[PDB]
Amino acid sequence: IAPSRGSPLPVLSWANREEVWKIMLNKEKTYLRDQHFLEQHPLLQPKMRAILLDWLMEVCEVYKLHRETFYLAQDFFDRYMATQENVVKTLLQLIGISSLFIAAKLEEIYPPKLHQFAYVTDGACSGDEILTMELMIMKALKWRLSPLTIVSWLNVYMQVAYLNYPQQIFIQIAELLDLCVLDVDCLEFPYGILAASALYHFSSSELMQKVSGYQWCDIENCVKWMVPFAMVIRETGSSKLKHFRGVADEDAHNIQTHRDSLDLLDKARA
């Protein structure tokens, strides 16, 4: 819904750039966000979501899951909660782990087995409960499990740049988005805007507009909101691209990593 947004996609041999871009734009019109969904769950507090999302991120690193798998789980969780009411703290771990289970099954070629998802809960969630919850989430989402995640938008933008060390820049911008996503207020902004604003903080308005099509006016508010987060990241130095056994060097940037971002989130909000 951004009348001032241009199309940054280069000419493509495999398809019509206009139709490719249009499908990407229409996703934001099917997959909604509600930064106030926790108001439907009075016994929940925003920090709980940050803690849950940070833990799933650490699960992802341990099993070397892809960044897309983590962001699919985050989008599934946030969209699912928006359809529910009066959920309590003791059920979040199961909702989160089942969201990751669905995500891993969709995105990984050889996903971890269900018993491994139960294992990481350390006796808190059984396999039968995850099987029950996955069906609950999928039906409540009306089986719409193909959004354009925050991190998938980063890949679109960085691919437009490359087709005009990119891996290290990607994981550094990804690290900033990983921090921002822990704050439920990030849902005020379209996933595409969040990705463009994080990229802007590691680049320029000119590159941002070239790779995303957004004008400065469309990202300014997100950019202002993201300011504290970009600053705590810049202050500590950004992380370095890591190597993963069994993962090809060409795909290493797409593997989810984890750092102690909960202390960074506090400093940023301060």
Place this chain on the structure above:
Amino acid sequence: MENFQKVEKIGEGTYGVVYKARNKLTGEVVALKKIRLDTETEGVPSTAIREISLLKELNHPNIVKLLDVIHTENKLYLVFEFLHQDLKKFMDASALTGIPLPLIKSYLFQLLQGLAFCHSHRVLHRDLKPQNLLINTEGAIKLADFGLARAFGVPVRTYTHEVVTLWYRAPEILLGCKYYSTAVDIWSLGCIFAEMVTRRALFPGDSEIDQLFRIFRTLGTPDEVVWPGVTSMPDYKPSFPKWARQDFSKVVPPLDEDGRSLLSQMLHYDPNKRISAKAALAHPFFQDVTKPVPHLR
């Protein structure tokens, strides 16, 4: 699921049985895929989740429709629209008489429209074989069986232990390419276009090397000139016999010059130069079935 009456078993896969079923109150016919969740160790099969989600996003007249998903007790039912026949049974039924060239052209045009739509959604089908192409009695044909489909926002890799088609497998896959591309779907459609014309599988290999040599005997042994990089591919061998490209007048006699032009571009060795689905729709072979629109800018 109480308003559906099972009429006949029409298939069976790793994850379930497929039934033709009739809606008792409306009389509409559907294809039901029954997943027995009791025997599923990992919950809803990953392939089922992916296919359901993809089909909800991919709505197009040339793509089989997913009408509903019904979770009964212990069972997940995938309710698909019903089409009476797959392209393989239609071609076999037409082996003696042959398929009229105008129906061949119309079918291929429709297949390319559905494929172009998939590629526009950044999705590779990877399993386009006549058994996965469904036809109705109104002259329409649709893409089906998206179980092997994958999105390519990031490169889709080749895996040694994945079961994929052989007769319709592209040569770059056979020669060990690390990744799939939209071109593998165009290659499959090219094999199918030739099969519709001749009523015989174009490359019916019985092993990976047999499949490769069959392609070489028809299109000629590739070299760096027709396909830059061939000599550097993992499974390439300088020992490969040198065969000459056959004349397409003998490979597909019933086809005219325009049809032979399209087929050669759909069967180009270089995945980088093989015609795209949107480009194939613009080929002169389809000038009678379509007319462009005015372009802005």
